[PDB]
């Protein structure tokens, strides 16, 4: 049930000047679209979605975790912390930091939560605990965004991202309340309007998390999409390119998502 219908991903990545990796699963039938799906691509900020899921998983055993107030100093405010900079003088709760990390890609929030989980190895351990043997986080922000060609640090594959996203948003990896909270945070993301969402009709529900590394044409998005009248679709689109100065493209990500939905026979 893989690639029952061929789609011109090769022409798309060639026009882009790099590599595009796509894995999309129709959770009803199990049919998939797969292109470079087992190659590694840099996670960039897309790790922050799985970080929030790991926090939610811990909150199942720590009843008061999400409401715990976290205070931080100016030293914690790294570039692009649009929410946490507004609460420097007050603090924020773990839940608020998690929402900011998912919905605004807030860097200070993500760093504080990463510290809570035991750093890159702790997030990697959480992903192993749901059966993901591909994901690896190795560095803190923002060194993890280097996107060096051939470097496996801070990477996963489109397939493993999709498989893990399915487990966390639709499967049993989180308890039901935490699952729906993860979904709600993804639905509330503000940074992905020009990526997978741009391929999704306005009358369908969707949640996503973006990543943008800032070198080597490297950017990505993963999403769960609820077309009306049929089972949800989970998909991941990751890009990279050979030269440090190559620019990423949101349009290429949206276009790859359209091809994935077309390949699955989802009328959009």
Numbering used by the authors: 25 to 57, 59 to 252, 254 to 294
The authors write:
Klebsiella pneumoniae carbapenemase (KPC) is a widespread SBL that hydrolyzes carbapenems, the most potent β-lactams; known KPC variants differ in turnover of expanded-spectrum oxyimino-cephalosporins (ESOCs), for example, cefotaxime and ceftazidime. SBLs neutralize β-lactams via a hydrolytically labile covalent acyl–enzyme intermediate. Here, we compare ESOC hydrolysis by the parent enzyme KPC-2 and its clinically observed double variant (P104R/V240G) KPC-4. To further study the basis for KPC activity against the ESOCs cefotaxime and ceftazidime, deacylation-deficient mutants of KPC-2 and KPC-4 were generated by conservative substitution of the general base E166 (35) with the isosteric residue Gln (KPC-2E166Q and KPC-4E166Q).
In KPC-4, however, a small change in the position of Q166 (compared with E166 in the unmodified enzyme) results in repositioning (by ∼2.4 Å) of the putative deacylating water. The positions of other active-site residues are identical to those observed in native KPC-4.
